[PDB]
Write a protein that binds this ligand. Structure first.
Ligand SMILES: *[C@@H]1O[C@H](CO)[C@@H](O[C@@H]2O[C@H](CO)[C@@H](O[C@@H]3O[C@H](CO[C@H]4O[C@H](CO)[C@@H](O)[C@H](O)[C@@H]4O)[C@@H](O)[C@H](O[C@H]4O[C@H](CO)[C@@H](O)[C@H](O)[C@@H]4O)[C@@H]3O)[C@H](O)[C@H]2NC(C)=O)[C@H](O)[C@H]1NC(C)=O
Ligand SMILES: *[C@@H]1O[C@H](CO)[C@@H](O[C@@H]2O[C@H](CO)[C@@H](O[C@@H]3O[C@H](CO[C@H]4O[C@H](CO)[C@@H](O)[C@H](O)[C@@H]4O)[C@@H](O)[C@H](O[C@H]4O[C@H](CO)[C@@H](O)[C@H](O)[C@@H]4O)[C@@H]3O)[C@H](O)[C@H]2NC(C)=O)[C@H](O)[C@H]1NC(C)=O
Ligand SMILES: *[C@@H]1O[C@H](CO)[C@@H](O[C@@H]2O[C@H](CO)[C@@H](O[C@@H]3O[C@H](CO)[C@@H](O)[C@H](O)[C@@H]3O)[C@H](O)[C@H]2NC(C)=O)[C@H](O)[C@H]1NC(C)=O
Ligand SMILES: *[C@@H]1O[C@H](CO)[C@@H](O[C@@H]2O[C@H](CO)[C@@H](O[C@@H]3O[C@H](CO)[C@@H](O)[C@H](O)[C@@H]3O)[C@H](O)[C@H]2NC(C)=O)[C@H](O)[C@H]1NC(C)=O
Ligand SMILES: *[C@@H]1O[C@H](CO)[C@@H](O[C@@H]2O[C@H](CO)[C@@H](O)[C@H](O)[C@H]2NC(C)=O)[C@H](O)[C@H]1NC(C)=O
Ligand SMILES: *[C@@H]1O[C@H](CO)[C@@H](O[C@@H]2O[C@H](CO)[C@@H](O)[C@H](O)[C@H]2NC(C)=O)[C@H](O)[C@H]1NC(C)=O
Ligand SMILES: *[C@@H]1O[C@H](CO)[C@@H](O)[C@H](O)[C@H]1NC(C)=O
Ligand SMILES: *[C@@H]1O[C@H](CO)[C@@H](O)[C@H](O)[C@H]1NC(C)=O
Ligand SMILES: *[C@@H]1O[C@H](CO)[C@@H](O)[C@H](O)[C@H]1NC(C)=O
Ligand SMILES: *[C@@H]1O[C@H](CO)[C@@H](O)[C@H](O)[C@H]1NC(C)=O
Ligand SMILES: *[C@@H]1O[C@H](CO)[C@@H](O)[C@H](O)[C@H]1NC(C)=O
Ligand SMILES: *[C@@H]1O[C@H](CO)[C@@H](O)[C@H](O)[C@H]1NC(C)=O
Ligand SMILES: *[C@@H]1O[C@H](CO)[C@@H](O)[C@H](O)[C@H]1NC(C)=O
Ligand SMILES: *[C@@H]1O[C@H](CO)[C@@H](O)[C@H](O)[C@H]1NC(C)=O
Ligand SMILES: [Ca+2]
Ligand SMILES: [Ca+2]
Ligand SMILES: [Cl-]
Ligand SMILES: [Cl-]
Ligand SMILES: [Zn+2]
Ligand SMILES: [Zn+2]
Ligand SMILES: [Zn+2]
Ligand SMILES: [Zn+2]
Lengths: 696, 696
């Protein structure tokens, strides 16, 4: 038969392994010839696999590259202007890749150019609370200083924004072994740890969902009108550069001024972690000098878009998308995901060649320029926003398949909780000790829900990947899944070799997943979700799961406000309308679920009428006016944290109105805005609930 | 049978006559007890007529009223401060209504309070070009002057905005007999002309689609957070008051300073129409003083919403809406429309009682507070925007049924041109001399299209009525129809008694439509359009008509730009992308129309898939970022003129970028914005075209 089992059985670990090897032999940096060649290869292969059409969609977007003949580096300079220490010009290449051409050296993409020279202030992780501690408590002023910040905890673009706002004239990012060196594990190539010469690449934009800096709101097509640089969205105003911990130790070791305020400011290097500013007595006349010569350049990028047309609802789209561009070899990020997508396409194509089609259309996407700010996914979504908003059922992301090998991670809309629970109960666990058990069983045992007994953890979607435009701008139900680390025992950030030259095929094959069993499990989770979404008669969304989470989020935001009881009294700040809206959503969702199970199952119009109510439910949380000063974050329930793009925040409008409210100079205005955000949230919740009422 | 003929035959002129009489005996000013009582009556009657449900939807919105014990008036004052002439406190009430309570005296709703005293400048119609003529050519400065402007040509809110921007400290609006007194016709009650004591009421806001000034973007419900007054949308900053031509003659007769620049500045009064500033020699020490004491007050308003549930697509809405609130008796505006809606509901209800239902749901609306800025329609649309944007097929307005008795007027989306042509060919003309001919025949003969032989004129939708939120904010196909004057021979603005106490049942019965035959014809046009929209298997929209008009609009905007050939060369301003997009839309629309006629007619999914493409076509012209500084005007092809809310403008983004461009101080920035608007228009046209392509 042609059912989900046939689809799942056709997926092969050996094929994913072959595809990963094929995708990781040379770098595929966005905007380069090598990445265009890979796009053409994937287009050809998807056509051979059996898709109905496979096209390239190209855009000309702002990218950023170092200057090949004027390299970026940081110096310590003495008072005579002699450069007495210089940071590395490149990462030592891994074994057997020492002759590989076009490895981009470490840089912070979109840094402006400059040669700032000054005294160093150490700012821990450069989080909002680290700057509060510096300014408010320690009385240390970052104005005109170069700040040095360790990577980890929050997206690097937020670190840069924070340092800017503090008055820094430059930022040095580094990987501390505390965050990137797991105890008892060897450095690459002998283990999966970051060596002292390893460096994390990555963009430092603050786009807030805009896509290409030059064309916010519209696709960067052939006739696009571009903003000038000075009006571009999200570019940093001060030079920024990343270094490894051998170079960081040389910059930190001479630091003087104030002691670190507490142990949470100390990494693992043999240095005092003094905050500064500047160096101790003997070295006090020395300074730090950055030399950044990178350039921003409008550059063509290419998405591959494959279509498998639906048999019954060809105007309903289920999208499986992940990116193809990499910083260097992309052994994990993204090619561990792209190899999984490739095998998924191949499996669907095998069924299609035997005469099967899914009920709904499935679109497959190989996005470009994700590493430069989600640029390929967002420009294509801007070009196709009308089709997506009226026909888009769901988006399933497919970046890295592994960030560890311990258990499953899922982040998604509450509309997909039941789907995920049900699918994982039918899949085999790949874990040692769980032979013959379900994936649901091993995942729930290893990663218990903080709320419910015998349920697994599912997180909110944050951001920092290609689902952002589909979920927080367009309101299309979205999800992601991968294998992850043991969250109890592993205190490090992500995986140690993230966005380094050392992220290779060998890293994966030797240290993460030699049997490709975790990759296969992730292909079964992502593929199975796409299968159910595209083939289930009734869309596999449970609106009642949204009701449960809305109450949890309402309790949470109310609890934050309730730290200020005097102000709530004075300004008559009530959450009554929001709780009322959540109560109503709960009631209306229950009655809808009854209809959904009791409706005349012979009637396709009642069915699609009810499928449209299911599809447009995520869409109902969109506010066309967007969130304050973030017009492309339009979802009222979920936005990326204003302090950390990677983290989701619930009721973000209210959260940001309440954040550090006790420091606002005009409490009446600040609490008025809290009340405005309560109104907007309560209204949006009730309006979303009413989409599930009887239609007439 | 239950078909359109049965529906049309059930409509009776005598019933419309009875309903008009019933609706016009007392005033129904928005926010008053009398208008709430009428709402409850209409709710009860719609229930009796057979609708499935009939509810009141209420909102608390900012309204404006004169102070009953501190009346508004204008004086001439001598240099001792004696008030030697005062304008009237009220219009002389018409015969047999001299004892009617609660007639609101003439005022300009939403004027601020004040007692400005100064010299008079006469500004013709206070249009943008009148102020250009004054400032640029005549070198007359309106700063700190009271301006006196004749009504007509443009919406009065635009006059007020223009005078503000000119630095006026107050505005006096008056009705000149040139614009409100048809030659050879008697003044009310002996004819349909405006008498010298008659005055036109009306709001002077500049809301640009926002709805209630205090709650832009969200419904003004029980828990709404309101802006403070100072942050409210669209309120005038200077006092404004309207007067009749007896009072205007007393203000104009002493005017000195400059002669009128030409005959187009002269009305029909026996005065010189001197521009000023101030009075001639002998009266030069005299001044004009306004006394305005009106107050803005948040006040409850009530929409009646009736539902006739669809048999097959109950989640598809066809809306027939018109307002119920009036300035005084509302004999034409709105009750000539509301009586027609009432008879339409009754006719549909008769069919329903016999076991018929329409294919799609029909919603019927009696809007409140239209006269105060489209407030009831817009607040309800804001509350229900998610349901409307995903389920709204079409909106048919139903304000005044007559503005004359010569021929038909239709303004609507190009998507409804074919519907209207076809429907009018099946209706009987009510015109003398056209007995036994079609309405199409009499309308085409009397009002030929300026473009095509043997076709009637259909105008673009402008604004100043309750379709604005549905069409220019939400992108729901919209239309309106009424009987109108002879446009060749009648040079006056609208009808003379517009928004006066004299607009009564007797006005209509004696002078406009004694037999109620024109009202019946308008009920057949509005009702027949609602019938076809709600019952036709395939939605009755022809996408190819949009293609034809898009080319006309592209030619028009290109022709405007081409008055500046040197600048187009210098700044490389090309319309190539827009013409390309229009060409593509034309091609894609043609192929869609073929599919629509050749599709397997047995397949409901291909049918509704194609009905959704038809429904979402108007929706595709919406830009979620809105037009520059007008976030609630989101339709890219059509917006109300920035110079006259009543007029539609095509490609408004490009039009406004080009307007008076030769006066801009920075031509490179101004032509850059023209190019940006070309890009936005070309992209939106192509994106709309692609919604009609094969879906997969
Ligand atoms: C969760 O869902 C419930 C419904 O189950 C909603 O309940 C509504 O709550 C509002 C209050 O926010 C109620 O509003 C009140 O309406 C009264 C009139 O209601 C009647 O008439 C209307 C038509 O106008 C019908 O729709 C309705 O069915 C009733 O027949 C008003 O008179 C009230 O105003 C008076 O009291 C208030 C409060 O003291 C004063 O401020 C006013 O000045 C005035 O004196 C009031 O506006 C509404 O009736 C409820 N609808 C119901 C029960 O069907 C919740 O609002 C919803 N939660 C959210 C967040 O939306
Ligand atoms: C009206 O509809 C037509 C289609 O019938 C659209 O035509 C497209 O027009 C654009 C130009 O705006 C063409 O863009 C060009 O694409 C070339 C590659 O096209 C091939 O590969 C792509 C995938 O990447 C396929 O989609 C496509 O089918 C082709 O197989 C590029 O190489 C071109 O760039 C080069 O030339 C330009 C111009 O000199 C330079 O600026 C560049 O630097 C570069 O050298 C160019 O981008 C596109 O191919 C056309 N599509 C077709 C024919 O299917 C119109 O755009 C549309 N009108 C509007 C307003 O949208
Ligand atoms: C995940 O799997 C669960 C468990 O199978 C699914 O819930 C079950 O769904 C079925 C089919 O809708 C329900 O059966 C229905 O029962 C009612 C009365 O109980 C009956 O009137 C209907 O005719 C129908 O038989 C079943 O009750 C329900 N079981 C539960 C909730 O425990 C669930 O829908 C799946 N989630 C998805 C698909 O997203
Ligand atoms: C307004 O009325 C006109 C005139 O009747 C309508 O156009 C006509 O629509 C019919 C039905 O779709 C067309 O018939 C079709 O003809 C094609 C080939 O000619 C055939 O393959 C189909 O099976 C079908 O019979 C007819 O051609 C067409 N006539 C025209 C355009 O002159 C029109 O659709 C109406 N407008 C509406 C409903 O909005
Ligand atoms: C990745 O796999 C592809 C597909 O097998 C390889 O590309 C093929 O290479 C052969 C020999 O050069 C050609 O004859 C084919 O035309 C190619 N096919 C396509 C679709 O491009 C590619 O060589 C492999 N890359 C690596 C690094 O192994
Ligand atoms: C307008 O018509 C309505 C409906 O016929 C009249 O209201 C009715 O009046 C009678 C007598 O007062 C009552 O017994 C009914 O209960 C009323 N019905 C409703 C639905 O309100 C109303 O009197 C008429 N108004 C005018 C000015 O003639
Ligand atoms: C890169 O550096 C070289 C060598 O100093 C210089 O000539 C060139 O302009 C730079 N490239 C840029 C700015 O793209
Ligand atoms: C650092 O680099 C600069 C630029 O090439 C050079 O002048 C300096 O000698 C170098 N310093 C060291 C310690 O190698
Ligand atoms: C920080 O630095 C500059 C002085 O160079 C000054 O403008 C700013 O106000 C300082 N802020 C403090 C000490 O809080
Ligand atoms: C993968 O699993 C093995 C065996 O459980 C373990 O030794 C190894 O550390 C894991 N690798 C990573 C990178 O976590
Ligand atoms: C209206 O005028 C009276 C009489 O002078 C005054 O007492 C009252 O305050 C005014 N009403 C308002 C401002 O609503
Ligand atoms: C105009 O009205 C004021 C206010 O009541 C009064 O003082 C004045 O005498 C009136 N003037 C005339 C000419 O009636
Ligand atoms: C108009 O009036 C005022 C003087 O009262 C002045 O500020 C303004 O610049 C004048 N403009 C002219 C004469 O153009
Ligand atoms: C209505 O029609 C009659 C007869 O054609 C005409 O005398 C009258 O002026 C018309 N009324 C209006 C208000 O145009
Ligand atoms: Ca863009
Ligand atoms: Ca509002
Ligand atoms: Cl992912
Ligand atoms: Cl109308
Ligand atoms: Zn990635
Ligand atoms: Zn990455
Ligand atoms: Zn009206
Ligand atoms: Zn009116």
């Amino acid at each position: 038969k042609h059912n989900m089992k046939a689809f799942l059985d056709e997926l092969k670990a050996e094929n994913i392994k072959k595809f990963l090897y094929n995708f990781t032999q040379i770098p595929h940096l966005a905007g380069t010839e090598q990445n265009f060649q890979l796009a053409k290869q994937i287009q050809s292969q998807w056509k051979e696999f059996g898709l109905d059409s496979v096209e390239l969609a190209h855009y000309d977007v702002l990218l950023s590259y170092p200057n090949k003949t004027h390299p970026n580096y940081i110096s310590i300079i003495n008072e005579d202007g002699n450069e007495i220490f210089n940071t590395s010009l490149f990462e030592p290449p891994p074994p057997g890749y020492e002759n590989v051409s076009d490895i981009v050296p470490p840089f912070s993409a979109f840094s402006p150019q400059g040669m700032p020279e000054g005294d160093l202030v150490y700012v821990n992780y450069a989080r909002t609370e680290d700057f509060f501690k510096l300014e408010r408590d320690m009385k240390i002023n970052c104005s005109g200083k170069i700040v040095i910040a360790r990577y980890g905890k929050v997206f690097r673009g937020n670190k840069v924004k924070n340092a800017q706002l503090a008055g820094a004239k430059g930022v040095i990012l580094y990987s501390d072994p505390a965050d990137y060196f797991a105890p008892g594990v060897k450095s690459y190539p002998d283990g999966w740890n970051l060596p002292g010469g390893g460096v994390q690449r990555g963009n430092i934009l603050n786009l807030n969902g805009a896509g290409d800096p030059l064309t916010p709101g519209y696709p960067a097509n052939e006739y696009a009108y571009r903003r000038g640089i000075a009006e571009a969205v999200g570019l940093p105003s001060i030079p920024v550069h990343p270094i490894g911990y051998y170079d960081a130790q040389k910059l930190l070791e001479k630091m003087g001024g104030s002691a670190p305020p507490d142990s949470s400011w100390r990494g693992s290097l043999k240095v005092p972690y003094n905050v500064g500013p500047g160096f101790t007595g003997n070295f006090s006349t020395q300074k730090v000098k950055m030399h950044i010569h990178s350039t921003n350049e409008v550059t063509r990028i290419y998405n591959v878009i494959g279509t498998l047309r639906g048999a019954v609802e060809p105007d309903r789209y289920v999208i499986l998308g992940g990116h193809r561009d990499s910083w260097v070899f992309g052994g994990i990020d993204p090619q561990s995901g792209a190899a999984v997508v490739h095998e998924i396409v191949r499996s669907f194509g095998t069924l299609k060649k035997e005469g099967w089609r899914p009920r709904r259309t499935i679109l497959f996407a190989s996005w470009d320029a994700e590493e430069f700010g989600l640029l390929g996914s967002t420009e294509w979504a801007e070009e196709n926003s009308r089709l997506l908003q009226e026909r888009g059922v769901a988006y399933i992301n497919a970046d890295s398949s592994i960030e560890g090998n311990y258990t499953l991670r899922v982040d998604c809309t509450p509309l997909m909780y039941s789907l995920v629970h049900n699918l994982t109960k039918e899949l085999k666990s790949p874990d040692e000790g769980f032979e013959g058990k379900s994936l649901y069983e091993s995942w729930t045992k290893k990663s218990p829900s903080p709320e419910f007994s015998g349920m697994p953890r599912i997180s909110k979607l944050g951001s920092g990947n290609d689902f952002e435009v589909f979920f927080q701008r367009l309101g299309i139900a979205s999800g992601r899944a991968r294998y992850t680390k043991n969250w109890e025992t592993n205190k490090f950030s992500g995986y140690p070799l993230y966005h380094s030259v050392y992220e290779t095929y060998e890293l994966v094959e030797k240290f993460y997943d030699p049997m490709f069993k975790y990759h296969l499990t992730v292909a079964q989770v992502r593929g199975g979700m796409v299968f159910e979404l595209a083939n289930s008669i009734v869309l596999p969304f449970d609106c009642r799961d949204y009701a449960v989470v809305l109450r949890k989020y309402a309790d949470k935001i109310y609890s934050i406000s309730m730290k200020h009881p005097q102000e709530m009294k004075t300004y008559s700040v009530s959450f009554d309308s929001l709780f009322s809206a959540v109560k109503n959503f709960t009631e209306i969702a229950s009655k809808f679920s009854e209809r959904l199970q009791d409706f005349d199952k012979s009637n396709p119009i009642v069915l699609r009428m009810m499928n449209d109510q299911l599809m447009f439910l995520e869409r109902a949380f969109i506010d066309p006016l967007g969130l304050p000063d973030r017009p492309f974050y339009r979802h009222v329930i979920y936005a990326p944290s204003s302090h950390n793009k990677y983290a989701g925040e619930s009721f973000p409008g209210i959260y940001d109105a309440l954040f550090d409210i006790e420091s606002k100079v005009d409490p009446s205005k600040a609490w008025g805005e809290v009340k405005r955000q309560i109104y907007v949230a309560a209204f949006t919740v009730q309006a979303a609930a009413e989409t599930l009422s009887e239609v007439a």
